[PDB]
C-alpha cells in the first residue's frame, strides 16, 4: 500500500526499490505572443529515479523534441515517464530490478502499472510523504546537464556523494531531504548557506561540498532554521 511516516524505515531495508518523481519531466515557460495571446515554450526536463538505499540516481533527460506535434502534454508526460521507467527496469539485470517502485505523485500510478504489466511481481506504490524531489533542478550540476542536452540522454549521479562511507542510508536520505526541502523553500538562502565558505569545495565527481562531519551538523542546523524562518515569513508567525 501507500508509503508514509509509519513505514519509513522500509526505504533502507535490503529489498531493492526506486522512487520515481515526474515533477520536472514537462517544464514550460509561459509568455505573450505578438498578438497578445499566451503561449508555452517547453524546456528540457528530467525524470528523477532514485534508489534511496544506495543513492543511485538514474536522471533521464527529456529533450523538448519529444513534445513536438503532440497534444495534451501534461498527460503525455506521465506516460512518457512510465515508458522510460519501464525501459530502465528492462535494461537492468534481473537481480538489480526493483521489487517496488514508489511514485511521488498518485497520477503516475496507472501509467506505470500499465507499462509494467510484464512485471506483475513489481509493486507500484504511492506515498503520503511530501518529498522535495522537485528541487533536484536546484542542484547546479544536475540543472546544467539537463539544460545542455541536445538529445535524449540518461546521466548517472550518486545523490549522496561519499556520505555512505561515514553515515547510514537513513541518515543520508534525511540529509538529502533536508537539503532539498531547504532549496525548495528558499533557493537563494539555501545556496548561500552551502557555498558561503570558499574553502569547502565540491569535488569534481560530487554534487555537494566536502563538509566534515562537524560542518554537516552546522549546515543541517542552518537548513532547519531556514525552513522555520521562511515558514514564519510565509505564515507571519
Amino acid at each position: 500500500g501507500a508509503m508514509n511516516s509509519s513505514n519509513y524505515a522500509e526505504l533502507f531495508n535490503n529489498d531493492i526499490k526506486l522512487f520515481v518523481d515526474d515533477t520536472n519531466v514537462y517544464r514550460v515557460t509561459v509568455h505573450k505572443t505578438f498578438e497578445g495571446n499566451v503561449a508555452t515554450k517547453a524546456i528540457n526536463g528530467c525524470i528523477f529515479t532514485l534508489n534511496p538505499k544506495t543513492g543511485h540516481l538514474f536522471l533521464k533527460i527529456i529533450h523538448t523534441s519529444v513534445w513536438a506535434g503532440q497534444k495534451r502534454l501534461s498527460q503525455l508526460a506521465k506516460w512518457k515517464t512510465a515508458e522510460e521507467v519501464s525501459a530502465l527496469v528492462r535494461s537492468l539485470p534481473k537481480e538489480e530490478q526493483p521489487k517496488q517502485i514508489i511514485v511521488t505523485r498518485k497520477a503516475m500510478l496507472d501509467p506505470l502499472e500499465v507499462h509494467m504489466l510484464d512485471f506483475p511481481n513489481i509493486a507500484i506504490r504511492p506515498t503520503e510523504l511530501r518529498l522535495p524531489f522537485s528541487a533536484a533542478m536546484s542542484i547546479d550540476k544536475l540543472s546544467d546537464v539537463v539544460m545542455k542536452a541536445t538529445e535524449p540522454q540518461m546521466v548517472l549521479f550518486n545523490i549522496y556523494d561519499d556520505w555512505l562511507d561515514r553515515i547510514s542510508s537513513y541518515t543520508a536520505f534525511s540529509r538529502l531531504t533536508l537539503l532539498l526541502r531547504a532549496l525548495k523553500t528558499n533557493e537563494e538562502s539555501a545556496k548561500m548557506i552551502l557555498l558561503s565558505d570558499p574553502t569547502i569545495t565540491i569535488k569534481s565527481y560530487h554534487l555537494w561540498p566536502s563538509f566534515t562531519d562537524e560542518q554537516w551538523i552546522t549546515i543541517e542546523s542552518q537548513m532547519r532554521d531556514l525552513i522555520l524562518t521562511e515558514y514564519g515569513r510565509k505564515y507571519n508567525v
Binding site: 503525455l76 506516460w79 512510465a82 515508458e83 496507472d110 501509467p111 502499472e113 500499465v114 507499462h115 504489466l117 510484464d118
Partner: protein, 300 residues
C-alpha cells in the same frame, strides 16, 4: 402459451416470474404459472419468507422441455425439474388448469418490457455462463461468485462471465500502452467483439443477462460485469453506430425497470458519471441520459 406447474407450495415464499412477483402462504392452493409467453427466455425466482437471505431461481425456455417446480424438504428449496413423459405432464397441467389453481403470467398487451430486457439473451449462452450440462435450465442465486471474482471458490457453482480487465495484457498492446488505456477501442472491437463474442448480439446478451442477475438476485459479481461491459463501450472512441444506438435502448429499459429503492446498491456512481459525462460516448446515450437524470439525479 406455456406453463411452469408446481407439485405444491409447502413453505411461504415470494415467487417472481420475470419482472412480476406475488406471495404464496404456507399450504395455500398454488399449482404454478400459466400463459407464459413463448419466444423469450424467462426466470422464475424465489425468496423464502423465513430467510430473505438467498434469493435464487432458474432461467428456462419452455421451447426446450416441460419444466415443473417441487419443494425439496431435505435441501430446503424449490427445485426446477424436467418431466420427459409429455403425455403425463400435459395431462396433469390440464387438471390443475381446470381447478383454477394456476396464476396467469400478467402481461399487458402494450408492454414490451420483457422483450426489451432479454432481446439478445439466449438459453444456449446462459448455459455456457452457468455450467450444469445435465439440465436444460440454469440455477442462479445471490451468493454465486464469478470466475474473475475467483481469481482475486467452488468452480462448478460459478458464473463464467467473460473476464474484462482494463489493466491486463489482453487489454493493452505492447507499445500502445497510453493509447489502449485511454481509448479502449482495440480491446472492445478486436479482442472482445471480433475475438471472443464474435458479434455485438452475443456481447449485448451477456450484458443483459448480467444486469438481470444483478437485479433479480442482488448478485454482486453480476453487477460488476454489467458495469464493466458498459464502461468498455463508453470508453471506446470507435464504436459502430448501430451498437451505440442499441446500447442506449438496452440501458434505457434497464434503468426504467430497476426498482427505485435498490438503485443505491445496483448503480455504480463512478461508472455512470464517467459514461454519461466524461467518456467518448457522453453524447451518444440520449435516452439513457434523460431517464437517469429524471429518475436518479442524486447519483449524478
Amino acid at each position: 402459451m406455456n406453463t411452469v406447474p408446481f407439485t405444491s407450495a409447502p413453505i411461504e415464499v415470494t415467487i417472481g416470474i420475470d419482472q412480476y412477483s406475488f406471495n404464496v402462504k404456507e399450504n395455500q392452493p398454488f399449482h404454478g404459472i400459466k400463459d407464459i409467453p413463448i419466444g423469450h427466455v424467462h426466470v422464475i425466482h424465489f425468496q423464502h419468507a423465513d430467510n430473505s437471505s438467498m434469493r435464487y431461481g432458474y432461467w428456462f425456455d419452455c421451447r426446450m422441455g416441460n419444466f415443473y417446480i417441487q419443494y425439496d424438504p431435505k435441501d430446503g428449496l424449490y427445485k426446477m425439474m424436467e418431466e420427459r413423459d409429455g403425455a403425463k405432464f400435459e395431462n396433469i397441467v390440464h387438471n390443475f388448469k381446470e381447478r383454477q389453481m394456476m396464476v396467469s403470467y400478467p402481461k399487458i398487451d402494450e408492454d414490451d418490457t420483457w422483450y426489451n430486457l432479454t432481446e439478445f439473451v439466449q438459453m444456449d449462452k446462459i448455459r455456457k455462463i452457468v455450467r450444469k450440462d445435465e439440465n436444460q435450465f440454469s440455477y442462479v442465486d445471490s451468493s454465486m461468485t464469478t470466475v474473475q471474482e475467483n481469481e482475486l471458490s467452488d468452480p462448478a457453482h460459478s458464473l463464467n462471465y467473460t473476464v474484462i480487465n482494463f489493466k491486463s495484457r489482453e487489454a493493452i498492446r505492447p507499445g500502445h500502452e497510453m493509447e489502449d488505456f485511454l481509448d479502449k477501442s482495440y480491446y472492445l472491437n478486436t479482442v472482445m467483439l471480433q475475438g471472443i463474442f464474435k458479434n455485438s448480439s452475443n456481447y449485448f446478451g451477456e450484458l443483459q443477462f448480467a444486469f438481470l442477475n444483478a437485479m433479480f438476485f442482488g448478485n454482486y459479481g453480476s453487477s460488476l460485469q454489467w458495469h464493466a461491459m458498459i464502461e468498455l463501450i463508453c470508453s471506446s472512441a470507435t464504436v459502430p453506430k448501430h451498437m451505440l444506438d442499441k446500447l442506449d435502448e438496452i440501458l434505457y429499459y434497464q434503468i426504467k425497470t430497476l426498482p427505485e429503492q435498490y438503485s443505491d446498491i445496483l448503480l455504480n456512481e463512478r461508472v455512470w458519471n464517467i459514461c454519461l459525462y466524461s467518456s467518448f460516448q457522453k453524447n451518444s446515450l440520449h435516452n439513457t441520459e434523460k431517464i437517469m437524470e429524471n429518475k436518479y439525479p442524486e447519483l449524478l
